[PDB]
């Protein structure tokens, strides 16, 4: 059935994005955001305008997307009459986006028709003379994770560039992007002065059926490249108007947790991909069954389902060390306390099982360790930068020098969360209650 | 090792290899729980 894999194939792109320009997807609730980027950029590129505007929204909300559509929209109407300059907050320093910006303006002026060459001070004020000094050429400037730039000890970047907005002959427009609702207290007083003020906050899922739209929009194949097209077009149509149907309880369960289109996305592909005919793929779309076994996957490796892995010497470990942090006034406990409390449960139940010594219950409490069940007593864990873990890497921790059965160790999992859904009628239920 | 002891003293040879691994897997199972690699090590070594 080729026409199976195309009607695959374009179902495929539609839910990863990847379709041409003409025919990409912009969700209704999307559209006004989408009208207020349009014109913008082309007040910058058509208009020789210079603006500045930061855009304030979550993660996955189609940021990059919305700039990136209407960046390759004019690409194909004006494209001689302007550059682009990407950065990056994250891949970028402070030093290092002078660098970035200079090596991208040399191969974007060689793509329409050196300032890169030399020291850091030589290629600044090469930049500096190119840009804060027929039609003239427009700079477009994306700036994702501008946050990082707005520090509080010094916004050199940020300056220069909204004084190249504010103040230059040459046309520039600078985007930037961040997560950070309250962005314009990061800004420096001289470099929010210079900034226009203008943010755009991105629009958020409102109601159910912005979800059950935009589900409507990538599903429905607007184009008849396969024969089966207006069949799939039927059900999906049925299926997405009865309100009692699957899909409609699954998209109403992302809009109660979730309220992302990525992430239904992320379960909607592997459903339309591991089909392997067209009544399959109907019979998934209708049942949506891989869903749920998705939604099981997702959820393997937490907390529960590492418990549910463990065998009758390690939860019997765990859950004695969960009575003495559960005892203690720190919450802490050791190796020998823990196996105080197993040896005491171990008699009092075959008092009413294989005892187990200490040099192999050694490995079972590395085990616990390792899976995350323990950790060490006020450990700060994976630190936030490269510096701040360069320190620590050069530093020697008091719990990793005094003997393993003597380090304090603090419970992922407490007690009452372990009778929870430990069952009933396994062997130490009784002792999760203390 | 078991080659030269049978020398020295194939559906067999899988059935004892395979009694000895659920033997292994049966007195040990408490003790490494489900890591296949200290299984792997405890069977290396009490094989020969
Ligand atoms: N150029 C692109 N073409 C197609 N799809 C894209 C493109 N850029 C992003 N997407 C898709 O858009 C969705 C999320 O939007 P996007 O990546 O723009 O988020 P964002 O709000 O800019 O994110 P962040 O704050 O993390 O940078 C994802 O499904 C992603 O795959
Ligand atoms: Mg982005």
Same mark, same amino acid.
């Given at each position: ?21 003409? /025919? ?29 505007? @930061? ?41 290092? *986006? ?58 050199? +970047?940020? $300056? ?5 907005? /504010? ?15 309250? @962005? ?26 912005? #979800? ?11 184009? /008849? ?10 059900? %999906? ?69 590492? %418990? ?8 019997? @470990?765990?859950?004695?060390? *969960?009575?003495?942090? +559960? ?15 197993? /040896?005491? #449960? @171990? ?47 050069? $530093? ?39 | ?48």
């Amino acid at each position: 059935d080729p026409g199976f894999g195309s009607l695959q194939r374009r179902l495929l792109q539609q839910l990863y994005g990847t379709l041409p320009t003409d /025919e990409k997807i912009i969700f209704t609730y999307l559209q006004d955001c989408q009208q207020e980027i349009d014109r913008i950029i082309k007040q910058s590129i058509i208009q020789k305008e210079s603006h500045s505007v @930061i855009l304030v929204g979550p993660r996955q909300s189609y940021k990059t997307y919305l700039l990136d559509y209407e960046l390759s929209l004019l690409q194909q109407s004006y494209k001689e009459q302007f550059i682009t300059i990407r950065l990056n907050g994250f891949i970028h320093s402070e030093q290092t *986006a002078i660098n970035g910006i200079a090596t991208q303006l040399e191969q974007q002026l060689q793509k329409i028709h050196t300032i890169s060459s030399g020291s850091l001070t030589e290629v600044f004020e090469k930049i500096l003379l190119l840009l804060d000094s027929i039609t003239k050429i427009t700079v477009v400037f994306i700036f994702d994770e501008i946050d990082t730039f707005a520090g509080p000890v010094r916004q050199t +970047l940020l $300056y220069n560039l909204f004084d190249m907005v /504010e103040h230059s002959r040459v046309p520039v427009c600078i985007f930037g992007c961040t997560t950070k609702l309250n @962005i314009l207290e990061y800004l420096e007083k001289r470099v929010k002065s210079r900034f226009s003020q203008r943010v755009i906050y991105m629009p958020q899922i409102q109601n159910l059926d912005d #979800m059950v739209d935009a589900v409507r929009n990538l599903l429905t194949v607007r184009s /008849e490249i396969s024969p089966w097209v207006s069949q799939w077009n039927e059900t %999906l149509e049925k299926e997405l108007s009865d309100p009692r149907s699957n899909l409609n309880r699954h998209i109403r369960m992302n809009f109660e947790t979730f309220r992302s289109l990525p992430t239904l996305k992320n379960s909607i592909i592997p459903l339309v991909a591991t089909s392997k005919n067209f009544g399959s793929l109907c019979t998934a779309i209708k049942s949506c069954s891989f869903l749920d076994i998705y939604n099981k996957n997702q959820l393997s490796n937490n907390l529960t389902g590492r %418990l549910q892995s463990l065998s009758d010497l390690e939860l019997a @470990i765990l859950i004695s060390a *969960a009575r003495v942090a +559960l005892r203690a006034k720190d919450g802490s406990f050791n190796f020998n306390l823990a196996y105080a409390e197993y /040896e005491k #449960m @171990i008699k009092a139940i075959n008092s009413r099982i294989k005892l187990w010594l200490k040099k192999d219950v050694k490995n079972v409490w590395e085990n616990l360790v390792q899976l995350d069940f323990f950790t060490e007593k006020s450990a700060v864990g994976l630190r936030d930068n490269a510096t701040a873990a360069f320190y620590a890497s050069n $530093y020697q921790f008091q719990g990793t020098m005094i003997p393993f059965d003597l380090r304090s160790y603090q419970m992922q999992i407490i007690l009452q969360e372990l009778r929870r859904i430990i069952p009933k009628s396994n062997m130490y239920y009784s002792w999760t209650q203390l | 090792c078991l080659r030269k002891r049978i020398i020295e003293e194939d559906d067999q040879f899988q059935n004892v290899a395979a009694n000895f691994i659920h033997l292994i897997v049966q007195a040990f199972h408490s003790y490494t729980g489900n890591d296949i690699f200290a299984l792997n090590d405890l069977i290396d070594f009490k094989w020969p």
